[PDB]
Design a protein around this ligand. Sequence first.
Ligand SMILES: [Cl-]
Ligand SMILES: [Cl-]
Ligand SMILES: [Cl-]
Ligand code: NA
Ligand code: NA
Ligand code: NA
Length: 42
Amino acid sequence: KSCCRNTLARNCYNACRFTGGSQPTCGILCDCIHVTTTTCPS
Ligand SMILES: [Cl-]
Ligand SMILES: [Cl-]
Ligand SMILES: [Cl-]
Ligand code: NA
Ligand code: NA
Ligand code: NA
């Protein structure tokens, strides 16, 4: 349920997940967060 600060960080996150990274890992490595709601903070 991912949320990233910009598109460079977004690509970071998707590639991280695809090559085996857990949610918390990918959030840490790509400066992203996970929410239980339908939208992210600006
Ligand atoms: Cl996970
Ligand atoms: Cl991991
Ligand atoms: Cl997280
Ligand atoms: Na993964
Ligand atoms: Na984990
Ligand atoms: Na982790």
